[PDB]
Amino acid sequence: KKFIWNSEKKEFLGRTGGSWFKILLFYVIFYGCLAGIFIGTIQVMLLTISEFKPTYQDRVAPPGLTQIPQSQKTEISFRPNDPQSYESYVVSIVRFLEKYKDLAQKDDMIFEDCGNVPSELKERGEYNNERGERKVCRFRLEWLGNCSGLNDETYGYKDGKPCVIIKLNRVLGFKPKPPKNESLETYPVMKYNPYVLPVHCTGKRDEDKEKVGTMEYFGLGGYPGFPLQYYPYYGKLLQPKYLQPLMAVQFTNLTMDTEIRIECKAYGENIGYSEKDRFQGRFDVKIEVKS
Amino acid sequence: KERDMDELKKEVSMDDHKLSLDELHRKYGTDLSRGLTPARAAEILARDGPNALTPPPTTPEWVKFCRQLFGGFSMLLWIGAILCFLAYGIQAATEEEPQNDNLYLGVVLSAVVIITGCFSYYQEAKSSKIMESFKNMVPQQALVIRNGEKMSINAEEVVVGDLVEVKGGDRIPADLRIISANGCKVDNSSLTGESEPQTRSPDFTNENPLETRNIAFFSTNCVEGTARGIVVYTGDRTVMGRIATLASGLEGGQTPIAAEIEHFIHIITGVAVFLGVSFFILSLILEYTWLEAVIFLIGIIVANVPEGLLATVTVCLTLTAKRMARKNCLVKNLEAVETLGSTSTICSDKTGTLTQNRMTVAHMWSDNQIHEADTTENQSGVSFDKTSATWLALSRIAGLCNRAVFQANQENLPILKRAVAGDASESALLKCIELCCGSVKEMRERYTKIVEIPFNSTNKYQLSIHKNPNTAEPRHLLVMKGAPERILDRCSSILIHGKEQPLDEELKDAFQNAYLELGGLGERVLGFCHLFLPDEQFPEGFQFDTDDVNFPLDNLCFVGLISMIDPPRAAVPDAVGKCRSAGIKVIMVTGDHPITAKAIAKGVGIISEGNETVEDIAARLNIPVSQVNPRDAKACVVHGSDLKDMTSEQLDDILKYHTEIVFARTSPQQKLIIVEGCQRQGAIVAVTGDGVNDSPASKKADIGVAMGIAGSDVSKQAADMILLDDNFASIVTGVEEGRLIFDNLKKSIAYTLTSNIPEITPFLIFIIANIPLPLGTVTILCIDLGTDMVPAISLAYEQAESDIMKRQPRNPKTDKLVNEQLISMAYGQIGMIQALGGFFTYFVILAENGFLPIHLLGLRVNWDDRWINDVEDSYGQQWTYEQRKIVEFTCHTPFFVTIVVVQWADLVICKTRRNSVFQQGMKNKILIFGLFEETALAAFLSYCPGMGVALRMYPLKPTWWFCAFPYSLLIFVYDEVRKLIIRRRPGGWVEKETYY
Amino acid sequence: DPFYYDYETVRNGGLIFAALAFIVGLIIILSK
Ligand SMILES: C[C@H]1O[C@@H](O[C@H]2[C@@H](O)C[C@H](O[C@H]3[C@@H](O)C[C@H](O[C@H]4CC[C@@]5(C)[C@H](CC[C@@H]6[C@@H]5CC[C@]5(C)[C@@H](C7=CC(=O)OC7)CC[C@]65O)C4)O[C@@H]3C)O[C@@H]2C)C[C@H](O)[C@@H]1O
Ligand SMILES: *[C@@H]1O[C@H](CO)[C@@H](O[C@@H]2O[C@H](CO)[C@@H](O)[C@H](O)[C@H]2NC(C)=O)[C@H](O)[C@H]1NC(C)=O
Ligand SMILES: *[C@@H]1O[C@H](CO)[C@@H](O[C@@H]2O[C@H](CO)[C@@H](O)[C@H](O)[C@H]2NC(C)=O)[C@H](O)[C@H]1NC(C)=O
Ligand SMILES: CC(C)CCC[C@@H](C)[C@H]1CC[C@H]2[C@@H]3CC=C4C[C@@H](O)CC[C@]4(C)[C@H]3CC[C@]12C
Ligand SMILES: CC(C)CCC[C@@H](C)[C@H]1CC[C@H]2[C@@H]3CC=C4C[C@@H](O)CC[C@]4(C)[C@H]3CC[C@]12C
Ligand SMILES: *[C@@H]1O[C@H](CO)[C@@H](O)[C@H](O)[C@H]1NC(C)=O
Ligand SMILES: [Mg+2]
Ligand SMILES: [Mg+2]
Ligand code: NA
């Protein structure tokens, strides 16, 4: 009963030829109308959103804190001798900082020299298109001391005592608000509390905090944070080739051949945290310089 | 070698009854008047086994529990669970930090099968429990004569070859060989199907042991008289013993509903494996390795398995079975409730099933006029004119001259079902007088009987003389009854409206033609006469000692005839008509005499008034029956004597060319042959019986219908459906519900099958477009096993869009439960719109949160990664892992809500297959609550405190609830106009392609 | 700030609606 394939009375796979044509034509017109309907409604949906601002921005309330070596498990394990062991790290660091070279930021019509000292926020009018393409404040690699260098095409970084820069999640219209001068025990930091978003790294328990001997921070003018003169962000459409602030962190006194945990927590009022997202506000890393 | 045993049982029985008394006693070594010594009896007792059929094969409860965990649907869900654990093992051992989705799903599917098994098993067990409360096996003792002494012992303690005496009222212990009888009449109704009490004579009469009179049978009760006999067969070797053993060892077959389930699963898995395989190949062609492709294959195939359809279908069948139990129409099988709707030929039993299996006064002949008394089983018909002196005289002759009286407890019982002592005919007469003439107690004692004359062996007649207490005439009243041919010889006066007239042939010939009317109608006629004795020639003190001529045998005054026969049950005629209206071939199958079976068939509807048999044509033409052509006769009577000498082809021809068939004088084995012949046609057969002869016929049939009280226990166990009320109209209710639930099942299936497209399509594009997952697994479970459960179940409560009792029975090879039309509607059109609505809500949520729909392409590589906490959206923002994942889950939740929204309109359109929503109307209150509960439950699953923590179902922004509304409206509009064109264009395009 | 959504009020209203529609459905199947 499963050989209904054909017969001398015209049937193919179960039905005739004229019936196959009728059904195929109906399904083509039907699905064509369905596709056109879905496309029209999706077009209406596209017309309900603007080009300069996302309608809902509450799902990104607490900004993240990422790093340059996007490790597979936020772990930095390599050998201070073998150059191929740490190739995966340096490759990503150079590719990340390739847009921060002095030659990339050369046009004066889209770049603006903010300053050598972190200043107040820079609001360039409203988010509409009434104004032209906004300017982006420059950030040369020289600000991250001891983790930038004047190396060749390959940034000869630190083999012993590695470097790990941190970055604040670029958010549209986000205005960072550092903690008040009434700092609730924020781990010794400079007195430049008003024009820079502080970020302080530390261990995680009594063991990690002891293994990590000394840490050296580098930033704009030497402050461990992000300057407010680079915020807020005005979207990729109005601010293409935008360069968010960077801040490097070097772990000088590390216990080689030992995996130690580091938590770089960014402090501020507009910076939230989360017990489920270890990246919202804070940042984790597992360094192990095995020789 | 059991095949040989069952074959030797299918053969008709044989015997050695035709033997002289000396030969029988020499063969059995038993005295004729003393039987045998008790030691000999005990020796045979511990030689073959007690005289009782071996118990049925016990079915342990763990066996049928495991049975309800399997079959075909449950088996599919089982392979689904196994495939889930297979994909889980491959994902566990092959990749880093594996997900627990396949494992959660595996244990969930396993639990679904187990719970469904427990529910279904509890239902079948409930029916079996109430059935066990029906065994009222009363230990009956037999009267055996051994060593020359009479003794009552247990029937099990009876052996072979010994004298056994039976009294009128005692049940025949084992199969006996009658040796000396005296007015013995036994009831072979439960065994061979003979209606009137067949007498038993010690002399051999017929070669057939069933028709002979020198054999008493197992389970037959001696109606009247006394008899003696030697035990020939014992235990299981007895006639009814071999019948019961045959019924237990027969095949049950495959119900039509189960076959439809098998076909449904074939198509489900066909498209499931097609999509899984083609997508496996597509995945390997893209970039995914063998590992990921295997995981995708299993996911796609298992996703196309309706997980919740098992329980919904089971509960649907259970609901209809509940309605069956409410009307005392019990079904031992949970799915046998549907078999009635698929039936196309009903093989019914006459005596007991169609008829009431009880002799009842049918017609009377008073004043040269026929009067039809009420013969219903509950007295609801027309009553005759009971106001003439002729009726008073006739009723007095019947109530006085009769050997029938009630018993002790016959008080709070109706006039019909009450017990009477004596002859069956006399019982019928007593009930008729006790019903249409007041009472017979004071009516009989008012006329004190002086001298009686019982019925004679030859020249039958029963007479008696009584005193007359009338206040007008002190003369004695003589009454007599007998066969009409015997009363015409002893009468000369005729009663008419009160006065007498001579035996004028002008009206006497009319009496003869009326007698031929009642006799040719398959009834037993009895003439009643009386006469006033001259008190001057027989004073009030004379005693009419019964020796010589003291009563004028001739010149009596005949009053009228009184016929009687076993009448059909109350709703039997109407019910039969209903079954013929639905297009079901009603075939009578019985072992009764043809002269009565033909008349009963004409009286119930099996034989239409106007159609003639092959013999009727020849009789009308006064020509031999071998001349007429069988094609000219739409109806035919088949005698069992001729049925034994038949082949399969001949029977096939008998069924194909004759629309009204009446199988008479058929042995139990031949009944089974009739059912098998009807099954060879490829049609669904249902057998309605009561006696032990109907046990094999009810067992082999697709569904056996037994009577809850008027049926033997064997056939009642071998059947699949029991009628505790014995109302045959239940058959009609049955064929109605079967078709009803069938169509409703189609609807309920299409509904669950529609949600599969929007359940799998998110994963398919997740593989193709490499975009984030639009629909998660947990939300899919909230749809298949959460919300849609109540709408799918409420779809079973749907009523008839048109008169189902008007359409013909569904063809098995044509009208399938699930066909290509259903799939074309659900998987092809509706589920497609639902999927598009889900993707719309998906893109809306992502675009409004900053991820343009075009930007989501190829983003899964960086999305599914747990450490890329800087994924760039369309506005240049960097989203952490848990932020965008929160968006994905808060995108799975409204996707599920979107499915509920499209399921609203999908439920409404599936509610009406052909009619419109405005025609049928939202009168199904259970469905209304289905929508309310479904909607409220979805909202609760999204807004309860902790859903995003337990089920990862984050709350929804109120705009998402309207993201699917136009899609649902469009679904409703398209299906509504489709049904509209099905109505206005009942031709072929919109009907043969969409109407499923 | 426009980065804060009053999710608590919406969730509360959703729960109230989920209770009202359900109890109304219960009244639906109980025609008395
Ligand atoms: C070596 C290299 O590795 C790099 O990591 C990669 C690499 O290992 C490959 C790896 O692929 C996974 C991942 O995409 C997850 C993907 O889940 C999909 C199939 C597996 C799941 C469990 C899942 C949820 C949905 C789930 C399926 C499993 C099937 C389902 C149960 C199915 C259903 C069946 C049903 O009855 O109802 C629904 C539909 C979809 C389903 O609900 C969806 O399964 C894939 C197999 O992703 C890693 C991130 C890193 C670095 O580059 C390194 O150098
Ligand atoms: C950057 O690295 C240089 C080494 O190349 C550091 O220079 C040393 O600084 C210490 C004082 O901290 C002096 O005692 C050494 O003589 C210096 N050596 C050289 C070769 O210059 C420098 O301190 C580092 N910068 C920071 C901010 O830590
Ligand atoms: C850097 O860390 C080293 C430890 O690795 C410190 O030197 C140790 O000091 C302890 C006493 O506290 C001695 O017992 C060890 O022998 C020392 N080890 C070495 C290698 O010198 C050192 O003081 C730290 N220096 C700074 C600037 O933090
Ligand atoms: C683009 C779509 C929504 C427009 C299609 C028009 C639809 C919505 C209109 C066209 C004809 C209308 C129907 C006309 C016929 C009937 C039967 C009547 O006794 C009650 C009104 C009722 C039930 C109407 C309901 C709404 C209806 C189906
Ligand atoms: C087609 C019509 C008749 C169906 C009637 C049900 C519709 C009107 C109901 C069912 C579910 C309802 C939603 C239930 C949940 C939410 C969250 C709540 O905090 C705001 C209201 C909102 C957004 C409702 C809007 C109206 C809604 C879509
Ligand atoms: C914070 O307080 C310190 C003294 O406690 C003072 O030197 C410093 O200027 C203050 N900064 C601001 C921004 O008020
Ligand atoms: Mg499903
Ligand atoms: Mg019967
Ligand atoms: Na059966």
Side-chain angles (χ1 to χ4, degrees), chain A residues 34-45:
Chain A
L34 281 191
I37 291 167
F38 177 74
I39 286 170
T41 65
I42 215 74
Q43 281 314 307
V44 178
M45 183 270 283

Side-chain angles (χ1 to χ4, degrees), chain A residues 15 23 26-27 31 38 41 50 53 55-56 58 60 62 70 72-73 167 169-170 244 277 279-280, chain B residues 96 820 824 828-829 832 836 840 848 867 869 872 875-878 880 882-883 957 959 967 993:
Chain A
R15 33 172 48 90
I23 294 183
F26 160 78
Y27 263 80
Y31 282 45
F38 177 74
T41 65
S50 80
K53 175 174 292 178
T55 37
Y56 290 114
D58 60 86
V60 257
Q70 289 288 310
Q72 179 72 284
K73 297 168 189 178
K167 177 191 53 170
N169 271 19
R170 190 176 23 182
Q244 61 258 294
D277 194 341
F279 285 86
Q280 282 188 3
Chain B
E96 210 74 43
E820 85 122 44
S824 178
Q829 306 166 5
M832 206 62 56
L836 292 184
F840 185 82
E848 291 194 8
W867 315 95
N869 291 267
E872 194 180 59
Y875 286 100
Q877 295 179 159
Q878 303 178 9
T880 83
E882 281 297 293
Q883 288 176 340
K957 308 167 187 288
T959 175
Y967 284 78
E993 292 274 8

Side-chain angles (χ1 to χ4, degrees), chain A residues 72, chain B residues 91 95 99 101-102 105 292 296 299 302-303 763 766 777 860 864:
Chain A
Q72 179 72 284
Chain B
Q91 286 172 126
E95 69 186 343
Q99 326 145 226
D101 277 89
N102 264 123
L105 183 63
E292 314 169 293
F296 295 151
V302 176
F763 188 56
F766 169 85
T777 318
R860 161 196 75 93
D864 285 43

Side-chain angles (χ1 to χ4, degrees), chain B residues 1-14 233 236-239 242-243 245-246 249-250 669 672:
Chain B
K1 201 194 172 183
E2 75 164 43
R3 273 280 304 170
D4 177 48
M5 299 196 287
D6 199 78
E7 288 191 17
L8 281 177
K9 294 181 59 57
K10 279 190 178 181
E11 299 170 335
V12 193
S13 53
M14 62 164 298
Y233 280 8
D236 305 84
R237 287 134 304 279
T238 56
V239 183
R242 291 183 283 189
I243 293 176
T245 310
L246 174 62
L250 280 182
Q669 302 85 309
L672 166 60

Side-chain angles (χ1 to χ4, degrees), chain A residues 229-274:
Chain A
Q229 41 181 5
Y230 293 93
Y231 291 102
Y233 185 50
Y234 280 60
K236 178 172 62 180
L237 188 145
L238 289 182
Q239 281 180 332
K241 302 176 180 181
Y242 171 78
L243 303 166
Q244 61 258 294
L246 302 173
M247 168 210 47
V249 172
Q250 179 195 347
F251 306 93
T252 40
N253 211 331
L254 292 187
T255 302
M256 288 194 178
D257 301 74
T258 295
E259 183 176 351
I260 60 200
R261 309 181 176 187
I262 279 294
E263 168 159 7
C264 293
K265 189 173 173 185
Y267 301 99
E269 318 207 18
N270 289 17
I271 289 83
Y273 307 97
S274 169

Side-chain angles (χ1 to χ4, degrees), chain A residues 11-24:
Chain A
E11 266 197 7
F12 178 75
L13 274 255
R15 33 172 48 90
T16 95
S19 176
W20 246 67
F21 171 66
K22 291 181 179 185
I23 294 183
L24 265 51

